[PDB]
């Protein structure tokens, strides 16, 4: 029995350098293989091709980087949707239908401020990177859309260095106020888009400053009877308001994006602002339950909108202030799984690592957790397992569990709850989960698992992963095989010898710079079958430290935080290698509290990993699903059954 495995990305990206891996097994001496991308209507036309040599010196594994040139694609509007991936050699010929996307670059629109007043000039530049996170000198078109949906300006600029500086957009003297949209796009080749937002608000001179200070940013069971609110008001700078009238109206809000709200006409009224500070207490129960919902269970994830108007008594001036929403919280904790694929491997202990966070998404320690579970076998015969209990580790927030299941189990319906000593049964956190068994026709299963689930996997170190299969035909497996993916491209591949005398074996992996944002590891072995060879696979998600290829560091001499106006100061910029640097100096007061908004600088780590075509923590229902969830299509003579019509990844 001789097998071949062709690994490619789930989708081909026009203009991208797509790396195609070939790993053959059972073949001796040396032989050659041709990898090719052809047109879906005609396999006569060749978008690109590469020759790879396979030998014992090569361990019968090689790699080839292919590129679908944009200029080869026709230039009528109706885009190409499928291509042919083809491998031809002396021994075999297999082809496959591949979808393509014209999304290939990334467009980050950086405006200096997110909020503007009339007559100001908006400074805007665009960072444009290709799929391989490289400068890519492509010309870019910016469009400006006003709050009424009118395209009011369009300007294109050539890109020289990967940073594209555009002329400043002058806000009119009396402009249209509201939320403006900027849309970035490429002029010729790709369909990639970028989008940013900025509000234009009219400046109004305030008589005084009004501040509202709640006891907490969330409302738990302890403050459901009393919620302290401190309302301050002061003139410009250090000066403070002597005497005033404070009027407070309260409302219930569904979400902060929608400006709709449900008032509570039982509001507090006529308190005294004395020497700058006033205080009130809000009885949540009384104010809601006559005018709205009966219970606090129906108040979970809704918000409490607060509006305050302060009318100073001496001069009669009026100023308004508002708190958009204080989220009602039913349980002080929220649960989420960490590094636990929702798939069962029959015969292998199934691990569950729960993680506890508070309303500010911070890891809470010392929290006891109770785990219950139901099991369903192939005969639909349910079995209720014995409950287990752990306590949350205070170094990472994790509460670990191990479950020993019968070999015949197929579905595991397990439910997790917190058991805090000071929480009522209603105020506890509860989450349910389901794990389905991996399906194999030879009763052959593979389970990989990465014991270092708390270290960041620092680049330069080594990844000691344990590959444990449980199956028959164990002592006829020759090797293990691996593919390492990051940012939607296969960066590594290889093979490790399987020891015929052990059950488990440690696989060592040097962690490289290609793996720095995120990585995915796919491990598989080939079980030989009389009728046909079978691929048994599993996958895991590797979270790796966010480290720059050319680390930038900016410093100010002098270094104290307090400076004087007009002070001559020096800025020191240092990079690992020669790099362009886009600088900005923004008044931090423009950000403050943000409602439904993300900082454009910290927006980059999340917008970059949309190119990871994988989802979840790993695993799959079968071999094809394991490959699919890692963002991979595969070609094999071992397995005939492939994923049909799976045009896009999850």
């Amino acid at each position: 029995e001789q097998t071949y495995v062709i690994s490619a990305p789930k989708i081909f990206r026009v203009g991208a350098s797509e790396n195609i891996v070939i790993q053959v097994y059972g073949y001796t001496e040396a032989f050659d293989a041709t990898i090719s991308i052809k047109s879906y209507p005609d396999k006569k036309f060749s978008y690109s091709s590469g020759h790879v040599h396979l030998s014992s010196e090569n361990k019968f594994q090689n790699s080839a980087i292919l590129t679908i040139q944009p200029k080869q694609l026709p230039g009528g509007q109706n885009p190409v949707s499928y291509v042919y991936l083809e491998v031809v050699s002396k021994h075999f010929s297999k082809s496959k239908r591949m979808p393509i996307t014209y999304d290939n670059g990334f467009l980050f629109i950086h405006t200096d401020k997110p909020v503007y007043t009339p007559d100001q000039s908006v400074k805007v530049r665009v960072y444009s990177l290709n799929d391989d996170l490289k400068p890519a000198k492509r010309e870019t078109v910016l469009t400006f859309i006003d709050p009424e949906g009118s395209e009011v300006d369009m300007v294109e600029e050539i890109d020289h260095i990967g940073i594209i500086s555009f002329p400043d957009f002058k806000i009119p003297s009396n402009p249209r106020y509201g939320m403006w949209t900027i849309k970035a796009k490429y002029k010729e080749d790709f369909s990639t888009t970028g989008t940013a937002y900025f509000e234009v608000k009219e400046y109004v001179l305030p008589h005084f400053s009004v501040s509202i200070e709640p006891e907490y940013n969330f409302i738990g069971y302890k403050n459901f009877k009393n919620f302290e609110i401190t309302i301050k008001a002061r003139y410009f700078y250090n000066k403070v308001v002597t005497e005033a009238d404070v009027y407070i109206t309260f409302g219930i809000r569904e979400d902060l994006k929608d400006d709709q709200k449900e008032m509570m006409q039982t509001a507090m009224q006529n308190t005294m602002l004395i020497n700058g500070i006033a205080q009130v207490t809000f009885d949540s129960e009384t104010a809601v339950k006559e005018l709205s919902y009966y219970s606090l269970e129906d108040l979970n994830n809704k918000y409490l909108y607060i509006a305050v108007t302060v009318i100073e008594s001496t001069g009669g001036f009026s100023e308004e202030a508002e708190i958009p929403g204080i989220k009602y919280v039913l349980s002080p904790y929220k649960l989420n799984l960490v590094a636990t694929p929702l798939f069962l491997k029959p015969g292998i202990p199934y691990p569950i690592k729960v993680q506890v966070k508070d309303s500010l998404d911070q890891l809470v320690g010392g929290v006891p957790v109770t785990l219950n579970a139901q099991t369903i076998d192939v005969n639909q015969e349910t079995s209720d397992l014995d409950p287990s209990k752990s306590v949350t580790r205070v170094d990472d927030g994790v509460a670990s569990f191990v479950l020993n299941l019968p070999s015949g189990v197929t579905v595991l319906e397990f439910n997790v709850k917190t058991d805090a000593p000071d929480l009522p049964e209603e105020n506890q956190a509860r989450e349910g989960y389901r794990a389905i068994a991996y399906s194999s026709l030879s009763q052959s299963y593979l389970y990989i698992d990465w014991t270092d689930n708390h270290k960041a996997l620092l680049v330069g170190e080594h990844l000691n992963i344990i590959v444990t299969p449980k199956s028959p035909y164990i002592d006829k497996i020759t090797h293990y095989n691996y593919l390492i993916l990051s940012k939607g491209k296969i960066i590594h591949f290889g093979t490790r010898e399987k020891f015929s005398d052990a059950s488990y074996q440690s696989i060592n992996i040097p962690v490289t710079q290609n793996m720095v944002p995120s990585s995915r590891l796919l491990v598989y072995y080939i079980v030989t079958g009389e009728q046909t060879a079978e691929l048994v696979s599993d996958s895991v998600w590797l979270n790796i430290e966010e480290k720059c290829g050319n680390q930038l560091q900016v410093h100010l001499s002098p270094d104290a935080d307090a400076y004087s106006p007009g002070q001559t100061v020096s800025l020191n910029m240092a990079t690992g290698m020669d790099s362009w640097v886009a600088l900005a100096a923004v008044d931090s007061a423009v950000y403050g509290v943000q409602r439904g908004a993300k900082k454009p600088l910290e927006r980059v780590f999340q917008f970059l990993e949309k190119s990871d075509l994988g989802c979840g923590a790993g695993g799959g229902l079968n071999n094809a699903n394991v490959f699919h969830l890692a963002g991979l299509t595969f070609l094999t003579n071992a397995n005939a059954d492939d994923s049909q019509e799976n045009d896009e990844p999850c």
Partner: nanobody, 124 residues
């Protein structure tokens, strides 16, 4: 809090057989993760052998695999390491170490471990 006491270490001929015992104080071991490590003088500490969960997983270093056998008597709350075919490379102080939590696999990393015995010397 966990206190840990190793015993059984001694002088042995190359080729000899020695059993190390790890006592846990203040915990019943349960399904927690526990391991053996070694440190030679002037060298960084290295994993030797481990057993995650209770008895269903068990991991050894490649240096010692096939020579050393790790076992647990749950009733006694003791860990045992049988050591056969010992060589001069096995001379080291041996430390029992344990983790907090129900981990199926043994971590090979000294940074993973929080409680440490005082150690026992093995001279081959």
């Amino acid at each position: 809090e966990v206190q840990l006491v190793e015993s059984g270490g001694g002088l042995v001929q190359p080729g000899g057989s020695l059993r190390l015992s790890c006592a846990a104080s203040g915990r019943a071991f349960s399904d927690y993760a526990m391991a053996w490590f070694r440190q030679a003088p002037g060298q960084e500490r290295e994993f030797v052998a481990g057993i995650g969960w209770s008895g269903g997983d068990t991991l050894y270093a490649d240096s010692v695999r096939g020579r050393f056998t790790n076992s647990r008597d749950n009733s006694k709350n003791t860990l045992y390491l049988q050591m056969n075919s010992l060589r001069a490379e096995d001379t080291a102080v041996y430390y029992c170490a344990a983790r907090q939590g129900q981990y199926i696999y043994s971590s090979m990393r000294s940074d993973s471990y929080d409680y440490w015995g005082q150690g026992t010397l093995v001279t081959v």
